[PDB]
Write a protein that binds this ligand. Sequence first.
Ligand SMILES: CCCCCCCCCCCC[N+](C)(C)[O-]
Lengths: 223, 221, 51, 51, 257, 179, 102, 51, 50, 50, 68
Amino acid sequence: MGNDISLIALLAFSTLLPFIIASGTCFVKFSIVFVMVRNALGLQQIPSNMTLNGVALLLSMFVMWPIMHDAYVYFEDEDVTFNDISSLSKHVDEGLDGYRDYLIKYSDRELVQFFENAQLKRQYGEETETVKRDKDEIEKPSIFALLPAYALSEIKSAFKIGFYLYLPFVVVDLVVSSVLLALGMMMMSPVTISTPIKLVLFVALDGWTLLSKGLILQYMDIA
Amino acid sequence: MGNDISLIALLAFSTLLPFIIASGTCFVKFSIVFVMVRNALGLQQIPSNMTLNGVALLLSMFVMWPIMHDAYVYFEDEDVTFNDISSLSKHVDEGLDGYRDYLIKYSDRELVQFFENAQLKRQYGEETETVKRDKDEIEKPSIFALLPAYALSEIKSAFKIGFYLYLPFVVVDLVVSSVLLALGMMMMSPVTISTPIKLVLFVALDGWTLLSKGLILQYMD
Amino acid sequence: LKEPVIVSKMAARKKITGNFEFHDPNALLEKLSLQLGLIWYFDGQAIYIYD
Amino acid sequence: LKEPVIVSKMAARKKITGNFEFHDPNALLEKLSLQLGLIWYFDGQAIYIYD
Amino acid sequence: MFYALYFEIHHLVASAALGFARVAPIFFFLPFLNSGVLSGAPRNAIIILVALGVWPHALNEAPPFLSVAMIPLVLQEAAVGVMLGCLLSWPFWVMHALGCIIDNQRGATLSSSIDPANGIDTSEMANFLNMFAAVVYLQNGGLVTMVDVLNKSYQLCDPMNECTPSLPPLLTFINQVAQNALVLASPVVLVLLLSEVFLGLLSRFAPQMNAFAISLTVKSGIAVLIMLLYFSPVLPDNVLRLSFQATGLSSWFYERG
Amino acid sequence: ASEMRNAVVSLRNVSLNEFNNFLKRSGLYNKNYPLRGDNRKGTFYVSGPPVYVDMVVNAATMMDKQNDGIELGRQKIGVMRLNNTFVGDRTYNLRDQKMVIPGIATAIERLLQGEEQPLGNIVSSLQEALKQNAAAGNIKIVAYPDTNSLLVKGTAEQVHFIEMLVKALDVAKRHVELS
Amino acid sequence: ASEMRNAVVSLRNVSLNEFNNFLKRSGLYNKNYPLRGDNRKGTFYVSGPPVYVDMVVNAATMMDKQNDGIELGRQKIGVMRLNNTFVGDRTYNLRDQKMVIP
Amino acid sequence: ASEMRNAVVSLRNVSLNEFNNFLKRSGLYNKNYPLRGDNRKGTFYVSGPPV
Amino acid sequence: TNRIEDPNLVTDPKELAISQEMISDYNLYVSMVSTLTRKGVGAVETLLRS
Amino acid sequence: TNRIEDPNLVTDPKELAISQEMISDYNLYVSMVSTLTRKGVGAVETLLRS
Amino acid sequence: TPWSGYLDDNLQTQVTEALDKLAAKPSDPALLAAYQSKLSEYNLYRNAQSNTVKVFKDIDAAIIQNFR
Ligand SMILES: CCCCCCCCCCCC[N+](C)(C)[O-]
């Protein structure tokens, strides 16, 4: 039997699941960094997009699955009682704070505050904002305010990281070119020589392993 | 009908019939080979799936019809044959051997053995001796164990057949790409040139004749 | 014992090792039933053993 | 005890270590019951133990 | 008891449904099972039959999971299935990488091959070697080892014990896949490099000679010629040395419950 | 050998010793797979090759239905003379009462009237048991004064019992003189 | 051995002895798997190989049903001469009252 | 040979000896597959080619 | 319940009204799980292609 | 549910006529909430897969 | 209709006869008393029969209509 509205909420949630994952989860970062590094090594389709997306997906679950499981453990709790729509709303909102905290940790306060204003202030006849003292609103930015502010910060972080990975390969390209000129062995295109070198060097140093650890250690302790 | 449960069982069977055809008949194989051919020629939407499945179902009819007819006359047969529960259950079981013989004749012996042992270890316990019937008369295995072995066996052999058909077109493609690089026209997409050569090659072979002949001769001497 | 023996699926998991002398199988059967945690019965035709 | 003994799963989760002497086992049993927080019963054929 | 057969059929379909979550992702990765080949009404009928062929418990007794939140469970099983799909895919992705390296070295950047089902870029050599490896794998009977490692995955780690893939080795996985491909491709790259520098050194005596345009004419012939000698070991060098095997399940997964 | 079939068969109008004769005359009998059971009773076990078993079970069921149509409760008419008394009822008109004395027929008939169990005995094999089952209420007695005799209709057993009772009843009376 | 079958049977018209004699005449009896119960009663326990058990159960059931066609409450007739009184009812025509003695 | 059919037939109003004469008069009788039974009774077994 | 109490209670209107609840609810539960697994697998395939 | 368990409600035409309405209104309400929810998520899905 | 392969009118004549006897002498109390009984039994027989034949038709129809 159960409740017919909680059934609707379950089925609805399970249809939106892949878009939430694709837009409000560390998958956003992991899937970007790998593809950037792959382009920088200069040989597309090695590794496959299947390999990369598969790994990125698996790693995202270590970070996110405990939070969802904690939320369901919060709701399956036979000792609660309610009296009114308000008392129920509060308890359901309280259930989501575990996720809310994660979004607050990894996103910008001022962009969040901007959208928090923009949901309302088309309504407002006034300029004063102090009118609520911060301690409530700083804790309770809405989730629709948090989501895009989180995604826009994740992308920027991804670019920051990939930038520093490009530099050494650039250096290697300059070295190769300068050597071909110093030898006067001019009429050979350097890419044919330097792409093997980039590949062998990065694999011989296990760049992918160090990269995977360096990404996860922002979100977990492996031990 | 002379009996009501005999009617209920017939309506249930007639309600599950299509999945039995989709998973325990050569249709599973013909359907794959034609899609492989379409992939090989590098086409996307033509011929349509409805046309290829049409011919695949027609060809499957010539192969399956004799045992469906045999089962039909066996169950219509008006001569007195059973009296009591043990005789009825044996009469029904005996009526299915015409089709067990089919599944067994084309299923891979190794897969049949795997799915049989893994059921024994569910029912009687994993400590029961692993049979290793390496020289074997497989003792009328259960149809729930026998059916997935057939399905994976037909998938295997259909893929195998499909592999062979690529090799000429693979040659065509690598040749064209080499002559274009020999001229330095690095910016030319080969597919534009290589598609018609594939089409005329297949037409000169008369592929569909050879292929539809052999696919049927594999099922009858 | 001079009787067929039937052992349940859940008893068959347990393992034993050693030398045993069958001077009095009835006594040995009782001792090992209490040591290993089994129950058993005898309809007059066969012996049945359970966890 | 001279009686087969049957233990609930919720009691099976608990672990114990040490060196024990089984003499006047009924007394030993009823003492451990209170220390470990078990309850037990005896119908005349076997002993049952629960959390 | 009258309704017992009715309930016994419902226990069966609940078990099959929870098995589909773990078997279908494998059918997504492998090159002879994906929907570029097996599609329409057969697809579900076959997946379900396999899942019932490997489920570990007697089908006629009540499923143990009725007391548990369904979503965390379904996601857990799907993640496990994705990990198994990768490990079973492992011999094919190496040959695909090899083919991509060769087709890149010989020029051929604008390759023609097509593949929409997996959504991955493909070249003529990559497609060829990826097919060839699959047929020799099937012909060696590996299809039995695939269902073996499926059944073992249920015996060694159970849905109800919260079985989980080990993290440390997963962090190595991509680099092992890259390494095996480079180690295997290395003989063709070196000869194609030496052939180009030889023409470069030759050009010193005739500076109007377009050594680059000459090398484009040569390199595809050299690449096929050389790959044709070291071709026959490609049978054993994949059929065993790269195939996953059921003993490996001990290290890649553990039970967390 | 794995194809061996077996069955238990039961009959209502025929005996195993009958059905054997049928098989023998037919030339279908086979001493390797004979019928096993009790000749006196209608229940037997049979086992053997399919064709043999099926034939046996068919034939035995259909012969049982054919014999089901034949009746065997042959009614027998017995004629019994009385040697010591008059067959009819008689009325004596005492001053005090109209008085009636019932004859043998009336007494016996009134006694057996509406009986439903078989008549067993008097004091002062399946094909047999199904004859012994005949109900007591069918016995019919008709007094025939013309020869001072009774007509009795029933089974051979019933008529016999009636004969005994008649000979237990028609004793010769003594004469008394009152002065 | 694991295939042993067993069952409980209860008959109304047939004695355990009757059934045992049937088996003995048949030559079907087997002293390793005899029927266990009360000779007087119709309720017994049987265990053994499949063919044996199934045959016993079918035979017993059919034999029991067959005997419903039988009746054994045989009625009996007795003649009892009164030595000390008249059999019939008697009416006494008292001048003021008619009295009847049954 | 594998097609031999056989059946048990029983008649209420017509004896076997009455039926054999019918087949003889018709010219349909065949001494390789004669009817097997009791000439007095009306129940018989026959086997042979389908027609 | 296997050979205890009795079978075949097709007929008493008080227990027959209790069976209706169970026979319906278990059919719904099993139907729901079938959809959830398809959704889950479909979400994984959606992400891996894209 | 209460309106049916209670014997004076389930046997008076005046009360039955009301219960009929309650049941129908319940049905329509739930069916419409379900429909609009599906249409809503279906819009999101249509746009994001485009 | 037979189940394929499965192993396994007097009252009408009696009523006709009694009618023919009665028609010859409608005033005989013994012929009247006899005919009353024969006709009553025949009536009950025909009714019970036709009700049963309908009940079986309606069960077969309900089965088909359940899967149709
Ligand atoms: C792989 C996703 C599906 C299984 C869910 C895994 C949840 C995360 C468990 C991480 C445990 C890490 N540990 C042992 C260091 O705590």
